[PDB]
Amino acid sequence: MSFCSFFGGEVFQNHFEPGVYVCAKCSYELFSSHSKYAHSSPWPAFTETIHPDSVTKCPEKNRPEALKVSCGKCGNGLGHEFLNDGPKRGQSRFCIFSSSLKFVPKGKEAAASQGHLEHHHHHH
Ligand SMILES: [Zn+2]
Fold this sequence. Notes:
Elements (H helix, E strand, L loop, with lengths): L18 E5 L32 E4 L7 E4 L8 E3 L12 E2 L5 E5 L19
Antiparallel strand pairs: 1-6, 2-3, 3-4, 4-5
The protein binds zinc ion.
PDB class: oxidoreductase
Keywords: MsrB1, SelR, Metal-binding, Nucleus, Oxidoreductase, Selenium
Assembly: monomeric
């Protein structure tokens, strides 16, 4: 008699490491650094979005307290915003499918910090 086993029940607690989001169709890297925060929990979501020209949304009929959002460029439509329901709270936040867009993490960690070096100037 011996037997060996060790587990917690789920892997989820380490899903907070830094990265970027890219299209499920277009593969182009797009998310604003301000539209999501850092936490380790069930129910991952983002408070805001980048609001570009290349994605679009439409309201529900049968669910008139929420709306669906699509990648109208490539013609997707799997994410949502539960809009006008929550306006004082952290109620009304966007939620999306894994088949709507992908995750590309950083190397190990780093990120979420400042550093600037840029110049071009001429006169003749
Ligand atoms: Zn797309």
